[PDB]
Amino acid sequence: EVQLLESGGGLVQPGGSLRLSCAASGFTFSAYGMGWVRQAPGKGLEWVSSIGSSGGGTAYADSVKGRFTISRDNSKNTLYLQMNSLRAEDTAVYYCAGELLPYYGMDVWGQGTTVTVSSASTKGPSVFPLAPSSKSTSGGTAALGCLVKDYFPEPVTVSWNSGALTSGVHTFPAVLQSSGLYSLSSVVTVPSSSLGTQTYICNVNHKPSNTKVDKKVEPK
Amino acid sequence: GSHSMRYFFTSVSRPGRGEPRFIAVGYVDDTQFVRFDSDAASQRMEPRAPWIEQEGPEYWDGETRKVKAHSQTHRVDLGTLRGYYNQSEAGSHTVQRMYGCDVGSDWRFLRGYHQYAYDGKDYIALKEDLRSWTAADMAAQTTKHKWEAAHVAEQLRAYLEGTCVEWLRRYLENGKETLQRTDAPKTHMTHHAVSDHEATLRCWALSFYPAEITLTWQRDGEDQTQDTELVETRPAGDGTFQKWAAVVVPSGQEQRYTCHVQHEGLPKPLTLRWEP
Amino acid sequence: QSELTQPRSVSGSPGQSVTISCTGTSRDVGGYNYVSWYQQHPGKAPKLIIHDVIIRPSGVPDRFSGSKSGNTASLTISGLQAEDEAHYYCWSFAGSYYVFGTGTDVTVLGQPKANPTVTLFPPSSEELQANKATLVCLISDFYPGAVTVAWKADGSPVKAGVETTKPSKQSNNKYAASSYLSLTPEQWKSHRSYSCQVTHEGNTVEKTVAP
Amino acid sequence: MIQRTPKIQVYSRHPAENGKSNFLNCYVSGFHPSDIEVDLLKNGERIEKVEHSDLSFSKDWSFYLLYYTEFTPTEKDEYACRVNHVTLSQPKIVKWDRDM
Amino acid sequence: SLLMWITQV
16 A cells, blocks of 8 residues: 655746655665655656665756755655745646655555645636536436636636545546636536436535635536 | 774775775774685674674674675776776776774864875875865876866765764764773893894883883983884784883993883883892 | 666567667666666556566566566566556666666557547536636547647637537547536537547547536 | 885794694785785795685785685794795795794 | 765765
């Protein structure tokens, strides 16, 4: 039940600090080289820094020479990355990752965390219900959704009915309009005869603006 | 008293036969505890003192891997060097690396080391401040500039100031029984008539640990240097050490000379006088 | 620092072999036997598939193999499969750092063309109440990954207030994209209806909503 | 190449007690380069179950190895280290010397 | 315990 779980990363101004933490569970943490690997949108895997074992560790990628500082506390199963003087270049998902032994490579990864370096303001989304159509209502099927409107940094999180509803949910990749803000929409497609029997709520989470919202989607 | 941990690495090209011979050893003070030899069967870092044998599988797997990488780096190094010194592929050459750290009687950090020789002369060394380099000559300036840009020292320093000393601490603790013993020297003096007119007085110091020792001669209580042989401290081969000091003295004057031994194992230093 | 270097993209048919080269210098990949490959599927963390040039972690399938010959490392996938379509990265030790490769794009040829299913919503009552208005076009399950989205209001084309995405590979290896049309409550009602037309492969498919 | 001619000592690990088993050692230090020939000789004959330590160096980068083997000292028996190395012009033989 | 990172010359 291996688990690296990244925290401490959001939006920060150019030249700012940020410090990422990674709580680790279900493998013997002190046996593993620990590391960070990041991944700017559209783009490929990088490698930021790694720390070892035991002896060995630390080293850093040439693009982070002396801005960044890795550290580990085993009595806490946690890994740290101090990140100072952040330039726009540094904008990416940062992944927490382990190696089973030296020079093995990263065989245990986290889910990733998002670092935006920007001077632009953090805006909280508007959540609107996308309500179902009546013709859709044959046998077959119905489309219902959530429009998560105008937010700054990615990401937003959307579950439905506190993540009990899984089947035929499609959260859509977001758009980046010229306003410099994002909209996305999650949609669930359900049988027409259950529009009048089931209850549909979407739970929108936007950690960087403390914007948690549960929206009921109900036939207009 | 103070303590250290040092690793030593050696590679030797052998063009025509396979790859360079690579030999690595680690010591804590004067006790070798690990070895690796590219030419040996097992292709593993191997234990060489009981107390390291305690370390679990992941230690051995990891250290084997790291020592391998050292060797493979030396392999590249041989080549890059050959190049910087415009030397032909024909000759055999040697790289030597040593690094590690010292701590005081409180086990608090004291000094760090890292240095590098090419064919038996310095090449590059991390200065005492663990912040700058000494290049031995012009070729090494290329390395120093590379490693300056690459912030190499910064990494070295963190290891030497931190990781190095933490592991040394661990070792000492685990090896308490043997490593923080002190074996007082067993001492005696011998006498050989060199001729009618002269005789050698030899002062012996056997079975001691650590290897740090001082043997000095005195005549009428004043430091005596002339007509003095003193040999390199040598391993007994059972973990302890030997040294000796000799003076040649006019016959009949033997009583004037006294030998002085100091060693951490001795509460007060000894004085020996030919004991007819 | 620098590099690694893989083909931008390699493709092949089901059952076939494919190889992804990864090339460096005598100093990393040529320096050491520590190359590993990773696989990354869309919006999911990388996974380690090779390490130590040739070893597969317990877990990973039999038809993956690593190799290296001089400064190039290779990954062969043999008996290619749908769920092998993904990005691959090599990665090597280099003495003083680790360095990932530039990554490759593995494709699986001759998949069936798949027509887009398009849903479109009108503005939410609640948005119209907040003096703003968005038409939401959601296009999904389409292959191959190209679409143009043309909006039409009344019957005339509307170029303005249209922001469409790039298409993403959905995890089923089809594609999805969406278009938002931004009006004010006034414009939305000034019109009999609005269409989101979606063209994919020369065939068009369109949907309409009215005030 | 900086070459360094080898310093050589040859001794018993234990005060030698004529009759009683012990180890004969020969210590070679101060030499560069590392390739080296060490023999231990009984009666100018080459003993050959001889075993050796792991190559290491000192501060000036010169190397040192102990060569050693189990033995059993008797009255009449010559014993001896025999070293050859690039820096020497003949192999050097050093007689063992109880009485030191 | 050995250094993990060895820089080439």
